Amino acid sequence: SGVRNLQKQVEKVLRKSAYKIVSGEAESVEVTPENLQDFVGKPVFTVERMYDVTPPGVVMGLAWTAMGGSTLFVETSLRRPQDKDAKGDKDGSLEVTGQLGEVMKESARIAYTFARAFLMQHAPANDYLVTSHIHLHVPEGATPK
Amino acid sequence: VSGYVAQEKLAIAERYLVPQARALCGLDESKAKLSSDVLTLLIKQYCRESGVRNLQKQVEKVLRKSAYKIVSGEAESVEVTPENLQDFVGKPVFTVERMYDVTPPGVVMGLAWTAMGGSTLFVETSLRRPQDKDAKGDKDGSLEVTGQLGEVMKESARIAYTFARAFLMQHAPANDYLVTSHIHLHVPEGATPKDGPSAGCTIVTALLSLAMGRPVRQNLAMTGEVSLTGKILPVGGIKEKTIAAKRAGVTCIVLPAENKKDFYDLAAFITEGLEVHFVEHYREIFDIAFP
Amino acid sequence: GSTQGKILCFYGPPGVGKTSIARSIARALNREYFRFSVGGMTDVAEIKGHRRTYVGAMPGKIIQCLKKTKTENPLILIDEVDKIGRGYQGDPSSALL
Amino acid sequence: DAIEEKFRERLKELVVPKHVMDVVDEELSKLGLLDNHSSEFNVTRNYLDWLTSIPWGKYSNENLDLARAQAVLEEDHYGMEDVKKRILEFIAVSQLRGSTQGKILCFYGPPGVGKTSIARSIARALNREYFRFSVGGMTDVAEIKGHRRTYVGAMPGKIIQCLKKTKTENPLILIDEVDKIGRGYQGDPSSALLELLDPEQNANFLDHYLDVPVDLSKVLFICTANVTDTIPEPLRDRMEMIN
Amino acid sequence: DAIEEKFRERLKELVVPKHVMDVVDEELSKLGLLDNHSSEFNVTRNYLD
Amino acid sequence: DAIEEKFRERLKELVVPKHVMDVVDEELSKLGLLDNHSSEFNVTRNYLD
Amino acid sequence: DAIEEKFRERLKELVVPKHVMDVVDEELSKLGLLDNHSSEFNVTRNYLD
Ligand SMILES: Nc1ncnc2c1ncn2[C@@H]1O[C@H](COP(=O)(O)OP(=O)(O)O)[C@@H](O)[C@H]1O
Ligand SMILES: Nc1ncnc2c1ncn2[C@@H]1O[C@H](COP(=O)(O)OP(=O)(O)O)[C@@H](O)[C@H]1O
């Protein structure tokens, strides 16, 4: 979000232009985009937004990190075969991960229980949540508040 | 500034290093010749370090022994020869670079951009409990990472683990080795934290080697960064990594497609004899390692 | 026009030849050379001397370089910045800025 | 100028470096500025003791025939022909390429193998002066480099005392138990040792207590560590590791 | 005058800043006011050098 | 008194609080008692500056 | 000299081991060099005690 890094780039381009002037060939450097990759090298970033199709169970989430803001993804997945027993009645315990702070732990359990309630209230025949274990990962970066 | 190729050290040391140490012992070339052959044997065997400091210690030692052979010893003109050499600098210490050669299943090479230079640290894994604890058993095959993990390396490890678990059912559903068994996994320390995740692409191939139990194809070093859905990500510091892979005799290598740029900046003589395979989605790599 | 200062940094595996290029530049430009290791240092007084009312005070290392090297524009070579002592006792690394 | 005169007739005998001569000249000018009874006069008069006491150019001459080294090692140490042949090659090569030459060396093995005993035996072989200096587990930098000399109770690092005691400019220092040196955040002496052990920068070593550069270039240092692996790489990579 | 004037011809070659000029000169004036015997004058003398 | 006099014309322009006025006055006199060469005179000199 | 000498008189009575004879001798020589005000003097005086 800051201008500091671009400030480094344009600096670099100019001083390389100085080298082309003081002894070099051109009496007047003229940067053009086709020219550019010479001076400042190959592109660094390209693949903005890691996932594009977002395979099930991954969602975008904005986060007001310590500097600027960044669009960190949240991800989840199964951790055991689900039908360990067709009659089994054991809570599908969650496992949170990603250098979690404890306040987030309480928030996580709240959101989990709301998921469990919404499903049986909506489509009772499905039972994926209450009958299976699940790992969930929140990337770090948000400031604690 | 970067490191130095094995051959590159020869052209350095014959000019900019040998005469200097010759001025340290005060001799002239007339009495203490050192052929190229002695130099190539030295650097190829006795010193595997990106810096030139270690070879500088060796050549010092050789010269000073020559000084002793002149002022009091027998010869008025020492003539080092490789057969002579073992006298002066003793017997060879290292030779068998890259310890395993048959690479028994579940061990894979992995490049690492350590704090100084780059080194071809291996990654290894193994069972920690009987596998058939219950034919009906439904317990998660919990992993146990080890090897001076930083916590960031722990999330990377768990991510790679889950992708392994998904890839098996995507490929060969009948096998269930991963989800039904405990596994210890060991990543040797040395990588600096910022590149820490870069080992991860190796990890998944480790596990899969253990799963079918078939060995990896020989000397196919790799690196990358896994995305939890089979996309691979750019890694940093490629030039050091490639030279470290060169020292170990690697004859193939696999990189994220996003770094197809930086690797080509390298001087052409540095890149001779490798056979790169850029890839982006993870499934690609699976077909360039096992079958 | 005139000569100009600028900061530069080199970094890489130890023993790649770094300091040697330093000196090669020093005899290239013809400026006088002066190494100054600071690895593991914590003495902010080295960057600033002492008050001269303190007992045993003498100006910081740099001034010794000016007295010895005799130029207004030498080529100082700070060494091993990575290991600068960044402690509670007055961080020299703040003093170097 | 009584103390100044005894140290000055001293100065006339031991051949001080001219740089250190003029530096003690300005320091002596300050001593003339300093009061006859001041406690700082006591600290700086005992500074003059530590500085003038140091030999500056006294040069113990070595034997250079290998034979006398043969005997004198055989006089006090049986067998172990590998270590003797190594020392024999050491003398044989230094004897060839003209002047004395430095190198650091280490011996290692189970305690009580005679390590220090051969150290002293070599010290009386070469005729260099002996001085043990244990560094196992040491942390403070005041015993290696010394104090600033402006601190209360300040004293110069151990080396200044070994030079004060041994009276030669080119002794055989024997640092002991290098492997377990305390490498902490409080100013790592083990890092500080590199200025001692740097082949070129030992020649102009200086320490905070007595500012004046010393010239250790003729010293033949020796260091003893029980195991070669624990020693940090920058220190370990220079010296040869005899066993 | 001896030390002061060898340093003064020193000063005459190098182009000192006027700030540093007046500083060295007033320090030289304090040398002249300070007695030669004082250890304070030895400190300012060492400083002048 | 020369140093104190440049100080006092200084102070004659800028208008000090009477508090710090009396403080500098007693320090000025305390300086004036002090020897022209004493180390503590140099300290109070630099301080009064 | 009083502390050193009462250590000396007891030395005349109790026969310290010859290694302790020497050690107490060099520490005794160290005692006179130190200031009574120095911090290390306290720990080394109590050490010799
Ligand atoms: N390209 C080179 N040309 C000449 N000497 C080199 C080169 N690369 C490395 N060296 C050698 O490496 C040694 C150490 O290099 P330098 O950077 O000056 O210190 P360090 O590498 O220890 O930081 C020197 O003795 C130097 O001769
Ligand atoms: N070959 C040998 N000749 C003479 N003495 C030996 C020999 N081997 C071991 N020793 C004895 O071993 C002891 C160990 O002493 P020393 O080397 O001085 O210190 P350290 O205990 O560190 O090895 C000495 O008392 C010495 O006499």
Side-chain angles (χ1 to χ4, degrees), chain A residues 40-44 46-47 50-51 55 58 75-81 83-85 95 97-99 133 135 137 140, chain B residues 136-142 151-152 154-155 158-159 162 165 179-180 227-231 233 258 260-262 264-265:
Chain A
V40 70
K42 299 291 281 291
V44 186
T46 309
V47 188
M50 297 155 26
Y51 306 78
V58 306
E75 296 162 337
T76 61
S77 54
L78 276 180
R79 192 151 71 87
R80 309 183 83 181
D83 184 1
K84 304 174 80 69
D85 269 332
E95 182 166 349
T97 318
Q99 181 66 45
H133 311 61
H135 196 171
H137 175 37
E140 198 67 7
Chain B
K136 61 92 183 181
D138 44 359
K139 299 86 182 163
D140 283 322
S142 76
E151 56 81 11
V152 184
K154 208 168 64 60
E155 302 97 320
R158 309 216 68 74
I159 288 165
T162 310
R165 274 193 181 171
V179 305
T180 318
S227 53
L228 193 140
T229 316
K231 202 78 180 188
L233 278 165
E258 307 212 344
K260 80 176 291 306
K261 183 268 178 173
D262 179 81
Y264 279 157
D265 268 9

Side-chain angles (χ1 to χ4, degrees), chain D residues 26 29-35, chain E residues 36-39 42-43 46:
Chain D
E26 294 99 11
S29 315
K30 183 178 301 317
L31 306 169
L33 303 175
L34 294 173
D35 296 332
Chain E
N36 63 34
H37 187 274
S38 57
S39 174
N42 308 144
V43 164
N46 167 36

Side-chain angles (χ1 to χ4, degrees), chain A residues 91-139:
Chain A
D91 282 321
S93 76
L94 175 144
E95 182 166 349
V96 61
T97 318
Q99 181 66 45
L100 194 68
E102 55 80 12
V103 184
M104 300 295 306
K105 210 168 287 295
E106 305 320 319
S107 71
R109 309 217 67 73
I110 288 165
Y112 180 87
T113 311
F114 183 20
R116 275 193 182 171
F118 203 107
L119 266 169
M120 59 207 100
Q121 208 177 43
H122 169 288
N126 169 289
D127 77 325
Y128 196 101
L129 268 292
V130 306
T131 318
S132 169
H133 311 61
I134 284 184
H135 196 171
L136 171 153
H137 175 37
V138 304

Side-chain angles (χ1 to χ4, degrees), chain A residues 7-71:
Chain A
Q7 204 287 336
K8 297 287 170 46
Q9 304 299 3
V10 301
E11 177 280 325
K12 172 183 289 194
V13 168
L14 282 184
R15 94 192 159 198
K16 204 167 302 319
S17 196
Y19 177 53
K20 274 182 182 54
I21 292 303
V22 67
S23 84
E25 306 80 10
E27 64 289 354
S28 74
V29 183
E30 162 43 29
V31 184
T32 80
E34 322 85 342
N35 201 27
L36 168 59
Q37 49 170 349
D38 176 315
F39 292 6
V40 70
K42 299 291 281 291
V44 186
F45 308 148
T46 309
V47 188
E48 51 84 19
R49 279 174 34 84
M50 297 155 26
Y51 306 78
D52 305 357
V53 178
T54 68
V58 306
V59 180
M60 311 194 49
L62 295 72
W64 181 77
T65 181
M67 66 91 80
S70 58
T71 174

Side-chain angles (χ1 to χ4, degrees), chain B residues 4 12 16-17 20 53, chain C residues 14-20:
Chain B
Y4 286 106
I12 280 174
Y16 297 175
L17 206 55
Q20 280 183 19
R53 189 182 289 285
Chain C
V16 169
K18 303 178 301 316
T19 317
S20 309

Side-chain angles (χ1 to χ4, degrees), chain G residues 3 6-7 10 19-20 22-28 30-31 34 39-49:
Chain G
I3 305 303
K6 66 92 175 180
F7 295 153
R10 74 175 287 152
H19 202 317
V20 174
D22 73 38
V23 170
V24 71
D25 187 81
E26 296 89 8
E27 301 294 77
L28 197 149
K30 188 187 305 315
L31 269 171
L34 308 189
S39 178
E40 171 183 4
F41 153 83
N42 317 320
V43 162
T44 181
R45 181 177 64 82
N46 183 20
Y47 173 86
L48 265 177
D49 181 359

Side-chain angles (χ1 to χ4, degrees), chain C residues 65-78:
Chain C
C65 175
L66 281 296
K67 174 158 184 150
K68 162 160 139 53
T69 68
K70 276 182 289 300
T71 74
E72 180 53 278
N73 56 9
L75 184 150
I76 286 289
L77 167 52
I78 289 287

